[PDB]
Design a protein around this ligand. Structure first.
Ligand code: BB2
Ligand code: BB2
Ligand code: ZN
Ligand code: ZN
Lengths: 167, 167
């Protein structure tokens, strides 16, 4: 497992739409997943998307005080995700992104989503998530469609540097 | 002349509306202006607004390859500015802000503005500016009404970190 560089906002690769994975359970795919977990763990992230390490594929991983009611979710590998948003209940919360280092912003997310897809072995995944779990999945899914969380912000008075917002 | 700390985005003082200066040509006002120029010069800025150093007053200073056609404008102190925007001609250009370190974004500005106000001696100032000159004045004026340039951005695909946007 190797630590890969995380691309920063401004890199046009973060704006592309990731392509689907076609072949499952390959040594190449296991290596990518392992590299992503090493990279995520090293930066103390709750999730990571393959475009963030320069891999333009529909692969996300996740697993983990601002959300003290959140149960722990075991590490998950989600490939070719299909999300279903569940209107109308939205929640505001603070987000940061490893591709936007040093900053936080308030982002509205669906309180609940369904997500499905496949793990790196090609096994089906199908879950309903709420709260922080749902927020992490939405944040990582956004990375696969070229969206970073400042694109989701509507109140830029609540966007700024972590050191100043939370001293 | 002393160098003051520049407040970073997230500090609620940058969102306040600055109060007008009431007394001109005082030792206190000259000291502020001197501190602002020392702070601006030190960060290699083209302008600075008093709220950026924690002074909630309508004081801006400015003076100075992305705008190679721009003539030099001598240092200016502008107090209680009154801007007139001149529609319809707008220009896009890259901006950075000392209160948003490490980032750049594309911002639409009026190509031309009129600005008036007073210098630190109480002498009237009244000018028409275009191009980069007009852009700097708009950027600094925004600081006095609680606006930072990410609030002006409409295309967040052209917002990111300088090191990545301009390597
Ligand atoms: C919350 C939605 C974002 C989850 C994923 C991000 C990591 C990332 O950039 N994924 O693409 C993260 O862990 N962000 C963390 C984050 O935002 N946290 C961690 C705890 C609470 C919240 C900050 O309010 C920190 C490490 C920046
Ligand atoms: C252009 C509108 C902004 C002018 C004022 C800012 C400084 C500032 O934050 N004032 O409040 C500046 O000098 N910004 C510079 C800036 O944006 N420049 C300098 C040359 C060209 C342009 C970058 O595209 C750098 C130092 C960040
Ligand atoms: Zn992220
Ligand atoms: Zn500025």
């Amino acid at each position: 497992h190797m630590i890969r560089e995380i691309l920063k906002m401004g890199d046009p690769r973060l704006l592309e739409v990731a392509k689907p994975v076609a072949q499952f359970d390959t040594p190449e795919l296991h290596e990518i997943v392992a590299d992503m977990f090493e990279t995520m763990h090293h930066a103390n992230g709750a999730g990571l998307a393959a475009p963030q390490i320069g891999i333009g594929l529909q692969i996300i991983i996740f697993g983990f005080n601002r959300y003290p009611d959140a149960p722990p979710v075991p590490e998950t590998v989600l490939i070719n995700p299909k999300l279903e948003y569940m209107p109308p209940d939205m929640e505001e919360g603070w987000e940061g992104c490893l591709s936007v280092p040093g900053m936080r912003g308030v982002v509205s997310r669906y309180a609940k989503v369904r997500y499905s897809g496949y793990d790196q072995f090609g096994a089906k995944i199908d879950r309903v998530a709420e709260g922080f779990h749902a927020r992490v999945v939405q944040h990582e899914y956004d990375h696969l469609i070229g969206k970073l969380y400042p694109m989701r912000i509507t109140d830029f008075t609540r966007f700024g540097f972590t050191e100043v917002l939370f001293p």
